[PDB]
Design a protein around this ligand. Sequence first.
Ligand SMILES: Cc1ccc(Cc2cc(=O)n3c(c2[NH+](C)C)SC[C@H]3C(=O)O)c2ccccc12
Ligand SMILES: Cc1ccc(Cc2cc(=O)n3c(c2[NH+](C)C)SC[C@H]3C(=O)O)c2ccccc12
Ligand code: NA
Ligand code: NA
Lengths: 230, 231
Amino acid sequence: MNAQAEEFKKYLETNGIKPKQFHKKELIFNQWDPQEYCIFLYDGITKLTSISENGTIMNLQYYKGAFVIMSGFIDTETSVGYYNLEVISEQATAYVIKINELKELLSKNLTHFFYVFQTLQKQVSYSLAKFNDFSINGKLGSICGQLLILTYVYGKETPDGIKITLDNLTMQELGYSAVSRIISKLKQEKVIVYKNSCFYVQNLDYLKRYAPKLDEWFYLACPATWGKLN
Amino acid sequence: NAQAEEFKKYLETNGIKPKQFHKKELIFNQWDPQEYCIFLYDGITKLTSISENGTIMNLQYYKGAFVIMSGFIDTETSVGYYNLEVISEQATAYVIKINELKELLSKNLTHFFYVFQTLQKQVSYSLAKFNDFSINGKLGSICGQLLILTYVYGKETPDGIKITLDNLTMQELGYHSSAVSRIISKLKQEKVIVYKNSCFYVQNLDYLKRYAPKLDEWFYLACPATWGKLN
Ligand SMILES: Cc1ccc(Cc2cc(=O)n3c(c2[NH+](C)C)SC[C@H]3C(=O)O)c2ccccc12
Ligand SMILES: Cc1ccc(Cc2cc(=O)n3c(c2[NH+](C)C)SC[C@H]3C(=O)O)c2ccccc12
Ligand code: NA
Ligand code: NA
């Protein structure tokens, strides 16, 4: 599956760093801490959020294990943004590292330096591809792109199409007014199907057509997974 | 800058040389199988993409000093079918093949770090732009771009904050859809930015900060020195 992550997991463990369980609605890091962290999210699903003074809560970015999320800059160790990383799966397993300690240990392994660098690269190109799909096709591009990524990562073929294999609690979190206008177009056009309390994708090519740049991103960033359905 | 001067030293020390590029040249392109690390030392560029048609998309602006990598650092393959186009009259850039580069980061965690921090800056820029648009729609995006322009190129004068860029470069950043037009009218109405004497002037910065709140925070956390100039 992800050998660079498994290698990184061991490097952490054989350097003193131990996995921490977190449970849903827990913040692995938060916007009010004076200390920033490098998070190696080894398993589970999280969301990055921003809580404005209004108290309105903004969902910015999803992440699944294995990945690295850093709440501060590696050089200055100060915040990259007033963010929280909330667990949305039932549990998540993460290794929590003070940014300053991380610097040391990326020194002694070119290979693990590269691994973490590469995940920032994938984030950068992800946002650019989402931006592009939204410039081309609006919210449709956005939702199709979200569904395309769900299909690639969590899809399993079944008779009613490509089922999305996330726990139901997890699915409601991810969203399963303006968004509504469109989901119906898809329910009705049988791109997706909500049957027997599960979500099914019946027309992968439509998703691909309106999220072309995220499709490309996934080919270039996760070719293993992209092939499984192309 | 300082940390970028540091990194430029490091490159020239190891044999890499600046090259000039001129408006409308591509420093790297989306069809070249070879990928590069670009240390853009001076000038203004845009990242672009094409779709099947021939339809140019402007995705992201960069100014020197900055680093722009067209391939992944481990696999060396493309991060996206992108071009980096010059939009200032000249741009100075150090071009580094990704393979040739990979040893060099290996030998200098200080310098590795400077490049790592630049990706982090990009990631959080994109998120903060997204946050602003989710709050305020097109107006948040428009004010956010004018906010950054002001911070980076703006000089305080009695006629307001002058954008110290030439009208050429200002058009390449765009200075006529109906939705945009209403916003422009609202801003050109409020005198938020005023064209005066073949120049561009910002007279309500509070407004910009008001509708681009998260990009404002981004600049504070990422470019504090420059942010404090106008705060
Ligand atoms: C529904 C949904 C959409 C997008 C993301 C973000 C995401 C997914 C993904 O598979 N990968 C990345 C991202 N971003 C961090 C760019 S980076 C490369 C790859 C990976 O994790 O190996 C979702 C993430 C989790 C759950 C649902 C997502
Ligand atoms: C008008 C305008 C908006 C945005 C950008 C992008 C940009 C500007 C900037 O000052 N910085 C960055 C970016 N992005 C690459 C995130 S990264 C940190 C900082 C820096 O250059 O050190 C513009 C860039 C050039 C010209 C105009 C811009
Ligand atoms: Na924090
Ligand atoms: Na290229």
